[model samples]
Target: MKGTIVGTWIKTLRDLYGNDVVDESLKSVGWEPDRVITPLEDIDDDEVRRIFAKVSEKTGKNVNEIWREVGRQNIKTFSEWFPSYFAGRRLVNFLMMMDEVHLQLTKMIKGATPPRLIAKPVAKDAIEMEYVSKRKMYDYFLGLIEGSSKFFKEEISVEEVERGEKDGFSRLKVRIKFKNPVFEYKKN
Candidate 1:
């Protein structure tokens, strides 16, 4: 599994059972409270499965239930983390504007081809954004987005998105939206 998947999972756990449960669970496995995960790191899927199992055990929740709960809650979290990406007078406007944010942010980094994020209006105050990354860059792209969220102090709600190896490329995409307008209004 990739770091972004793991990061998304971690965030999912936090969203489902609350941060305390996820934080404690991470500590059980010797994860730093604020560690940044990089790409190309191989982690056992069994470990993740085991972790979710433990979460089920500790919370009196089913493993699949835990997963489902995480999925349901991720959207709210995404909204909180990426408000600028979802901020606009309208949902379509917000999403189109986010494309610019991705382009500009990527341009700032040398040799960093962050995943392409596309946003589309889904409701009056809601927009669905998709994240697509290059092969072997799943974790790196996810980490970059998570890091960017932290750096900006914005929030977002994410769905499972997608994960798989296709055409000799590993890709991950997440569908997320914002429930409210949480972006700064700039005069520029």
Candidate 2:
């Protein structure tokens, strides 16, 4: 079942930004306006790439700029209805925590990939998080990482690794090391 809240937010985005913005964005990359992006849609990386490319083309803006703006601006819509997600956190903190929020939200529905986020507890006070994506999604991934850092008021060290494409598959791995483990802290 789709959350009434998410549906509301989507409607609000359409209302505020104009459905043309969302419709053109979806179509620019080849998604039909009638296409339903369900909780279970295993949307391909290439489709996402095409959509971003189209949005960039349509708005005469770069994909990174579009993604960052969308990502930053989405917080108010989400936090207002989903108060538990933001609870007592600052906007920056809420934005920084979106990766986790994304995962949880997707998990609530059927057939969500939740983007492969691999975080390993490395030291007593540090954890290593790795974001892996298909070869073409490097730009989106990088933009998200940079944007998250800018929003979070925390520093992270990122290492990029090259994975060769074989058997029609290619990958990009970004390893992020956290200096302070906000997600790992135990509540007193």
Candidate 3:
């Protein structure tokens, strides 16, 4: 994970919960509350998991839900920080391009293991997206999808098709249906 995103998560956690909660969660993980994270720095994913776990325990909230809310809130912050990704793009196009974007963003960082986001148009108005990773953050992925729809002002229906672990890799497949057709099909 990038320190920049993790830093944003801390700030957004404070916004969603409070400064005290965020501080305590950081303290529980032996991290300074006021520590600065550079945008290019690589942070351990386990460290983030521990911090969120501590926050979940303290707040009596599900860890998955915590990640989901964080993901949902991050859409706005991400768009603001990297507006070019969102410019002149609709929801489907943005999502379809995310795999490449993820690849590009992590190129400069060492040990950044972003999940593989593979999407294909299944129909004129729907797409099938597969998330493959070791992290198994399905809820967070779903939340981000939801947030994208809201941010783009498009209505969508998301259905999980499968979830499982194979050879230490977690996989989640989902079918996302848009309210309007995003692609055109023509008969020859």
Candidate 4:
């Protein structure tokens, strides 16, 4: 994982839990208490897992709970760090562009295997999204959609149609209903 993603998690953890929790989690995982995660830095995947395990113990919350909350809060961090992506865009546009954003990042960042976010407008007020990834961070993905709704001040209801692992990939299919119409669905 890149530090950009891991760094966002660290920041969100500090915001959601507390600095002491993050500090203690890092220390317990044999990381420097004050270590700074720089942008574009390649962090070990297992190291991230161990750190989160420590975080789970320190915070008394399950890892999934932490991921969901962190995912929600991380949007705020992203909005602050990269405002242009959200500028002049509603929730739908932002959500729709996620696939492009992920693929583009992977092309630029070597060894970065970002998730595949495939979304299709199915109704004037709804879209079907499929999340494909090896990480199986479904809670996090769902949280991000919820967070995007809140950030854009848009009300949305997400229905999980199905989720399972297939051929080493974790897939989650969801239908997201919006309070207001954001698209004109047409057969392609």
Each candidate structure's TM-score, on Cα atoms with residue i matched to residue i, is 0.42, 0.51, 0.92, 0.92
Off-target runs (Cα >4 Å) in candidate 3 are 186-188
How close to the true structure is residue 28 of candidate 2, measured as C-alpha lDDT? 62
Clashes of each: 17, 0, 0, 0
Candidates' lDDT values, in order?
A: 0.58, 0.55, 0.88, 0.87
Better of 2 and 4 by lDDT: 4
lDDT, candidate 3, 77-108, per-residue tens? 77877788898689999999989887887889
Candidates ranked by lDDT, best first?
Answer: 3, 4, 1, 2
- Candidate 1 local lDDT, 158-182, one digit each (tens): 5655677766545555655554664
Per-residue lDDT of candidate 2, residues 66-170 (tens digit)? 655554444455555556865666433543465686677677555554445555645544444455433444554565566455544667777775545556444
Q: Write the per-residue lDDT of candidate 4 for residues 62-130, one digit (tens) a residue.
A: 999988988888899889877888987989999999999888755756777889999998999999999
Against the correct fold, how does model 1 do in TM-score?
A: 0.42
The TM-score obtained by model 2 is 0.51
Q: Which 10 consecutive residues of model 1 have the lowest summed lDDT?
A: 135-144
**Candidate 3 structure, TM-score to reference:** 0.92
Candidate 2 residue runs with Cα over 4 Å from true position: 1-51, 68-83, 88-104, 107-111, 124-126, 133-136, 161-170, 179-188
Clashing pairs in 4: none
